[PDB]
Amino acid sequence: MKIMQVEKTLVSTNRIADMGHKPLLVVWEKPGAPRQVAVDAIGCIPGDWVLCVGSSAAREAAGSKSYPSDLTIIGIIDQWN
C-alpha cells in the first residue's frame, strides 16, 4: 500500500463492461511522478492524499474478486502533507 495524490478524473467511454460504473482517477505519489489510474472506491477530490492498494487486493477492494483492477483507492488519509 502506498500514498498517492489525486490529480484529476479519467473517462474511458469504450472500456470493458467488467469495470462496471466505478470512477477512474489519475493519481501520483507526488506532482511530477509517473501517472497512474486507480479505481475510486471511496470518492475523493483532486489534491487529496489517499491510500491505494494493488495486486489482487485491488480487485476485491473495487467491489468484486473478479473486478479488472490492479490499483484501487481504499481510503483518504486524515492528516498528510
Residue 52: name the closest of 6, 8, 11 by CA: 6
Nearer to other proteins, 22 or 55 (CB): 22
The residues near 66 (Cβ < 8 Å, ≥ 6 apart) are 18, 59
| C-alpha 15 chain-centroid distance | 16
**Are 46 and 27 a contacting pair, CB within 8 Å?**
no
Nearer to a copy of itself, 2 or 46 (CB): 2
Decide: is 16 part of the binding site for other proteins (CB under 8 A): no
Binding mask 7-36 for a copy of itself (x = CB under 8 A): ---xxxxxxx-xx----x----x----xxx
Decide: is 56 part of the binding site for other proteins (CB under 8 A): no
* Cell (9 digits) for 49: 492524499
Decide: is 35 part of the binding site for other proteins (CB under 8 A): no
Q: Binding residues for other proteins, per CB under 8 A?
A: 9, 11, 13-14, 20-23, 40, 42-45, 48, 76, 78
